[PDB]
Amino acid sequence: NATEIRASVGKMIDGIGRFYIQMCTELKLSDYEGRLIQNSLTIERMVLSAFDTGGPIYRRVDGKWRRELILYDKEEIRRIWRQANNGDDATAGLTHMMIWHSNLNDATYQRTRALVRTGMDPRMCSLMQGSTLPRRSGAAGAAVKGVGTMVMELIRMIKRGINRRTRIAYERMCNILKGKFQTAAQRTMVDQVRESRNPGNAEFEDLIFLARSALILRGSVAHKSCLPACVYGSAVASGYDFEREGYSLVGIDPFRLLQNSQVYSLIRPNENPAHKSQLVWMACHSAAFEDLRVSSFIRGTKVVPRGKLSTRGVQIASNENMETMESSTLELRSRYWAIRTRSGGNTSDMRTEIIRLMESARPEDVSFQGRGVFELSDEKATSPIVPSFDMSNEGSYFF
Amino acid sequence: NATEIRASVGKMIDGIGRFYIQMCTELKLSDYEGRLIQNSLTIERMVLSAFDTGGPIYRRVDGKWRRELILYDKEEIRRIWRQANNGDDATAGLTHMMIWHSNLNDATYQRTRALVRTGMDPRMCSLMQGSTLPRRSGAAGAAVKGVGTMVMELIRMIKRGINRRTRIAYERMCNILKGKFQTAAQRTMVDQVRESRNPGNAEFEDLIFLARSALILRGSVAHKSCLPACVYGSAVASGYDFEREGYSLVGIDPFRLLQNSQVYSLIRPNENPAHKSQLVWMACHSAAFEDLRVSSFIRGTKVVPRGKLSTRGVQIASNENMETMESSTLELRSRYWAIRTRSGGNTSDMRTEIIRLMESARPEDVSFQGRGVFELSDEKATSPIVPSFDMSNEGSYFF
């Protein structure tokens, strides 16, 4: 059923577009200045703030870039927003940029300080997908969350409490949690946790276990390709009428759109452009915890690890100066595309059950058997391509 | 009358055999792989589930053991089953494996969590024979139940209620209960309990008493030697045609059969084979609450207590891995054999009557006077052998 799902989400994409265009028309920005991922970000956040303000806005004068600090009627923003969505709320829409930000943050930063202070192992990076994503996120907003993400929450919710209506949350938060697991025991053990009203260290220690079980017996976590507002604004302005022509966040749509996007970015004096583009590209698909090998394969070019990456962050801090600042054109095109999946793959004390399953598991264990990559011409999911990694690679752990 | 009883039960044994063989022929297992108590179990449970599914199936490749997770048409299973029993249901047959599982569980595990949560003393182990045995078990299925087993039920049935047709159950459940006792007062006091429609703590407290009376003035509880499906499958395949040659569950038949069985078992890296065999052997005769002294006497070799036993359970959990897994040949042969009995032995406020009887009772009080053990040649019950326990023994309480 390509009617609702493909076209209803198109309508949510149209809104973001239209809005971005309106909002650019207010700031009286130029074309080059509306394609500046920097300005786009600021706008996106102005809105999510107002629906739950001012921000940094960069301008282009003969030669150099001028940063403007501006403020807008928090309500005016809310007004312009609905105008674009037919006076609707389109929570989906706000939630969408709510994720684009997430996926950018899960790739720009490593959230160790928080994991440890929670009592999670810092090496549990690949499980913190969407830890930045405000709880306000929608129902299809949490589905993108990693197993580890959920645990950090419950553990804090529990840690302060064990240190009224709050209950329905906890059970559900677990049901979701449990719905991440895709194996008997995994599933069953979550229940054994959800049994206690005042779950103390008994649980505190057990979920942490299950957290680690997912490192081997992963769960189902959806990935959503959420592009910057500018990309959708520009597309809408170019005539693309997505609600009519349909759009996806896990199909070929997002890659194809990024195959023509003209996004620019501010870039510090010593930073590497190629390295900058990489970053953004990984935020456009939630590939911050993907196997670098595959990311590079699909990308078309080296996908260098975080450490070796030359950049501190896409947003420009108030600290920096504009004199020594310039801007490059972001390389967002990719070689092939792939169905962003949700599945994690698979081959007494319920712990034992898992520990026993954990064991038989080898890192070499092939997942998504038969699934492959698609050419950018292959609109339909017709012919798949299987990658062979016998190759001089460059790692697998972005972090 | 050795016609119906000996041959009708043979026919139920043929069914299990035949079926196991058919079912092995489907899974395309090998001879060694059909003798693996592990696989046998899985099959047995696949069936009891379907008559009231998939399971763990271990395979043998060059060197190492491969665990397959498989699923079968719940109805297909039911189809193959009847095919083996002449299109009959042979509830007896399912009930038989229903017990083999029971007797294995009453020996592999100690069910304390449940006794206490019911309000029974954890030290009432020797009275929980068949607590695992689904209520679906047949009429000759409950006869195997310990006095304590019944109490845990009524107490829960009562505890939730006191906290329509359900009545005929309660009275009968007591009549059975009462039919366990083999002394005046014991018998009479059960009636005094069965008098109340809504039996509250009045009863709750009284049966618990009677539970403890059985620790001294035991009741009649039948023991059934129920071997794994593989053992009967293998036997049937070897030509033994039990319905014609007769078979028992409380005679020499079961021991004799186990004198030639070639059963193999998966065994964890640090576990003791000799210790593994012991376990299974005790499940083959419901000797999980027998006096270790006698068990070892008949066994032929030390029957070590549960604590000192090196093993966690015969079934392999999903947690574990196969790399560090190997398999041994189970020692199920015994020195002598003995008529598995049913009898527990024997020498105002009806409580008083019992308490007074309780008293005169000494642990040294000899039971089954004159009854002895038989050589494995002594097919007939001809010549009995009396054991003398003056000896450096190793305990009496498996638990």
**Of the candidates B195, B123, B190, B118, which has an alpha carbon nearest to the alpha carbon of residue B351?**
B190
Question: Does any CB of chain A come closer than 8 Å to the CB of residue B262?
Answer: no
Residues after which chain A is discontinuous, using a C–N cutoff of 2.5 Å: 52, 163, 347
Q: Other CB atoms closer than 10 Å to residue A29's CB: what's the count?
A: 19
Query: B168 phi and psi, to 5 degrees?
Result: -50, -35
Cα(A231)–Cα(A263) distance, integer angstroms: 7
Cα(A151)–Cα(A211) distance, integer angstroms: 7
Cα(A354)–Cα(A366) distance, integer angstroms: 19
Cα(A158)–Cα(A167) distance, integer angstroms: 11
Cα(A62)–Cα(A84) distance, integer angstroms: 33
Inspect the interface and report whether the beta carbons of A356 and B312 lie closer than 8 Å. Answer: no
Let me know: does A279 contact A311? Beta carbons within 8 Å: yes
Structure tokens at A74: 């928090």
Cα(B261)–Cα(A172) distance, integer angstroms: 52
Query: A267 phi and psi, to 5 degrees?
Result: -140, 120
Three-state DSSP state, B314: coil
**Of the candidates B220, B221, B148, B217, which has an alpha carbon nearest to the alpha carbon of residue B355?**
B217
Cα(B32)–Cα(B186) distance, integer angstroms: 51
**Of the candidates A229, A176, A212, A284, which has an alpha carbon nearest to the alpha carbon of residue A14?**
A229
Q: Dmax of chain B from CA atoms?
A: 74
Cα(B330)–Cα(B144) distance, integer angstroms: 26
Let me know: does B139 contact B158? Beta carbons within 8 Å: no
Cα(A9)–Cα(A93) distance, integer angstroms: 9
Side-chain-side CA neighbours of B23 within 13 Å: the count stands at: 35
DSSP code string of B3-50: SHHHHHHHHHHHHHHHHHHHHHHHHT--HHHHSBHHHHHHHHHHHHHH
Three-state DSSP state, B103: helix
Let me know: does B171 contact B194? Beta carbons within 8 Å: yes
Cα(A361)–Cα(B323) distance, integer angstroms: 9
Cα(A316)–Cα(A279) distance, integer angstroms: 15
Cα(A399)–Cα(A110) distance, integer angstroms: 8
Structure tokens at B360: 């005169």
Inspect the interface and report whether the beta carbons of B321 and A361 lie closer than 8 Å. Answer: yes
Three-state DSSP state, A352: helix
Which residues contact residue B282 at a Cβ distance below 8 angstroms, ignoring those fewer than 6 apart? B107, B288, B290, B295, B303, B398
Torsion sign across C-alpha atoms B205, B206, B207, B208:
positive
Alpha helices in chain A (DSSP H): 4-27, 31-34, 37-50, 74-84, 91-108, 112-118, 139-142, 147-162, 166-180, 184-194, 201-213, 229-237, 242-245, 252-257, 273-285, 292-299, 350-360
Let me know: does A107 contact A283? Beta carbons within 8 Å: yes
Let me know: does A115 contact A128? Beta carbons within 8 Å: yes
C-alpha to C-alpha distances, A201 to A119, A158, A160, B334, nearest whole angstrom: 11, 9, 12, 48
Inter-chain Cβ pairs, chain A and chain B, closer than 8 A: 47
Angle made by CA atoms B266, B272, B275, in degrees to the nearest 5? 95
Buried b (16+ CB within 10 A) or exposed e, B128-147: bbbbbbeeebeeebbbbbbb
**Of the candidates B140, B151, B128, which has an alpha carbon nearest to the alpha carbon of residue B207?**
B151
Structure tokens at B240: 């033994």
Residues of B in contact with A354 (CB under 8 A): 318-319
Alpha helices in A28-134 (DSSP H): 31-34, 37-50, 74-84, 91-108, 112-118
Let me know: does B110 contact B306? Beta carbons within 8 Å: yes
Let me know: does B238 contact B11? Beta carbons within 8 Å: no
Structure tokens at B136: 């679906």
**Of the candidates A369, A385, A386, which has an alpha carbon nearest to the alpha carbon of residue A377?**
A385
Nearest CA in chain B to A217: B319
**Of the candidates A244, A293, A324, A312, which has an alpha carbon nearest to the alpha carbon of residue A395?**
A293
Q: Tell me, what DSSP letter sits at residue A128?
A: -
Query: Å resolution of this model?
Result: 20.0
Which residues contact residue B82 at a Cβ distance below 8 angstroms, ignoring those fewer than 6 apart? B88, B89
As beta bridge partners, residue A58 has A67
Mutation target among A212, A351, A359 for the B interface, most CBs of B within 10 A: A359
Angle made by CA atoms B385, B389, B393, in degrees to the nearest 5? 130
Which residues contact residue A347 at a Cβ distance below 8 angstroms, ignoring those fewer than 6 apart? A360, A361, A365
The helix (run of H) or strand (run of E) holding residue B399 is none
Angle made by CA atoms A275, A297, A112, in degrees to the nearest 5? 55
Cα(B304)–Cα(B327) distance, integer angstroms: 21
Question: Does any CB of chain B come closer than 8 Å to the CB of residue A80?
Answer: no
Inspect the interface and report whether the beta carbons of B319 and A361 lie closer than 8 Å. Answer: no
Residue with tokens 């015969």: B314
Inspect the interface and report whether the beta carbons of B317 and A348 lie closer than 8 Å. Answer: yes
Minimum-distance CB partner of A355 among B313, B320, B324: B320
Cα(B345)–Cα(B295) distance, integer angstroms: 17
Cα(B260)–Cα(B262) distance, integer angstroms: 6
Torsion sign across C-alpha atoms B306, B311, B316, B319:
positive
Q: Tell me, what DSSP letter sits at residue B386?
A: -
Which residues contact residue A121 at a Cβ distance below 8 angstroms, ignoring those fewer than 6 apart? A115, A212
**Of the candidates A70, A90, A72, which has an alpha carbon nearest to the alpha carbon of residue A81?**
A90
Structure tokens at A163: 């240190």
**Of the candidates B57, B50, B12, which has an alpha carbon nearest to the alpha carbon of residue B34?**
B57
Torsion sign across C-alpha atoms B42, B46, B49, B53:
positive
Nearest CA in chain A to B322: A360
Structure tokens at B11: 């026919």
**Of the candidates A234, A198, A285, A228, which has an alpha carbon nearest to the alpha carbon of residue A43?**
A228
Angle made by CA atoms B73, A356, B272, in degrees to the nearest 5? 110
Let me know: does B221 contact B144? Beta carbons within 8 Å: yes
Structure tokens at B83: 């095919």
Q: Which of 100-129 (B) contact A at CB < 8 A? A: 109
Inspect the interface and report whether the beta carbons of A352 and B324 lie closer than 8 Å. Answer: no
3-state SS of A368-395 is CCCCCEECCCCCCCCCCECCCCCCCCCC
Let me know: does B106 contact B288? Beta carbons within 8 Å: yes
Mutation target among B111, B271, B319 for the A interface, most CBs of A within 10 A: B319
Alpha-carbon distance B60 to nearest alpha carbon in chain A (angstroms): 15
Cα(A166)–Cα(A151) distance, integer angstroms: 16
C-alpha to C-alpha distances, A343 to A139, A179, A190, A218, B229, nearest whole angstrom: 18, 11, 18, 8, 38
Which residues contact residue A391 at a Cβ distance below 8 angstroms, ignoring those fewer than 6 apart? A293
Instruction: Taking each helix axis as running N to C, give the angle between helix A147-162 and helix A166-180, from 0 to 180 degrees, rounded to the nearest 10.
Output: 150
Which residues contact residue A353 at a Cβ distance below 8 angstroms, ignoring those fewer than 6 apart? A184, A185, A188, A189, B317, B318, B319
**Of the candidates B55, B136, B43, B131, which has an alpha carbon nearest to the alpha carbon of residue B92?**
B136
Which residues contact residue A22 at a Cβ distance below 8 angstroms, ignoring those fewer than 6 apart? A80, A83, A84
Buried b (16+ CB within 10 A) or exposed e, B238-254: eebebbeebbbbbbbbb
Three-state DSSP state, A63: coil
Q: Tell me, what DSSP letter sits at residue B357?
A: H
**Of the candidates A49, A57, A53, which has an alpha carbon nearest to the alpha carbon of residue A27?**
A57
Alpha helices in B181-228 (DSSP H): 184-194, 201-213
C-alpha to C-alpha distances, A321 to A59, A65, A66, A164, A324, nearest whole angstrom: 14, 10, 9, 50, 6
Buried b (16+ CB within 10 A) or exposed e, B197-219: eebeeebbebbbebbbbbbbbbb
Structure tokens at B125: 């182990």
Residue type, B359: E
Residue type, A185: A
Minimum-distance CB partner of A354 among B109, B316, B318: B318
Torsion sign across C-alpha atoms A368, A374, A380, A384:
negative
Residue with tokens 């929670």: A118
How far does Cα B135 stand from its chain's mean position?
Answer: 15
Let me know: does A286 contact A129? Beta carbons within 8 Å: yes
As beta bridge partners, residue A267 has A326
**Of the candidates A213, A249, A220, which has an alpha carbon nearest to the alpha carbon of residue A337?**
A249
Structure tokens at A279: 């970053």
Q: Other CB atoms closer than 10 Å to residue B163's CB: what's the count?
A: 6
Let me know: does B344 contact B218? Beta carbons within 8 Å: yes
Query: B68 phi and psi, to 5 degrees?
Result: -100, 135
Cα(A328)–Cα(B174) distance, integer angstroms: 86
Cα(A328)–Cα(A338) distance, integer angstroms: 27
Question: Does any CB of chain A come closer than 8 Å to the CB of residue B326?
Answer: no
The helix (run of H) or strand (run of E) holding residue B377 is none
As beta bridge partners, residue B66 has B59
Three-state DSSP state, A265: strand
Q: Tell me, what DSSP letter sits at residue A133?
A: S
C-alpha to C-alpha distances, B216 to A164, B121, B227, B346, B361, nearest whole angstrom: 51, 15, 30, 9, 7
Question: Does any CB of chain B come closer than 8 Å to the CB of residue A192?
Answer: no
Question: Does any CB of chain A come closer than 8 Å to the CB of residue B67?
Answer: yes
Burial class (CB in 10 A: 0-12, 13-18, 19+), B44: buried
How far does Cα B33 stand from its chain's mean position?
Answer: 25
**Of the candidates A238, A236, A242, A232, which has an alpha carbon nearest to the alpha carbon of residue A284?**
A232
Let me know: does B206 contact B348? Beta carbons within 8 Å: no
Let me know: does A362 contact A349? Beta carbons within 8 Å: no
Strands B65-71, A264-267: pairing is unpaired
The helix (run of H) or strand (run of E) holding residue B56 is strand B54-60
Structure tokens at A103: 């996926």
Let me know: does B332 contact B261? Beta carbons within 8 Å: yes
Q: Tell me, what DSSP letter sits at residue A397?
A: B
Angle made by CA atoms B369, B128, B267, in degrees to the nearest 5? 100
Strands B326-329, B264-267: pairing is antiparallel
Cα(A358)–Cα(A356) distance, integer angstroms: 6
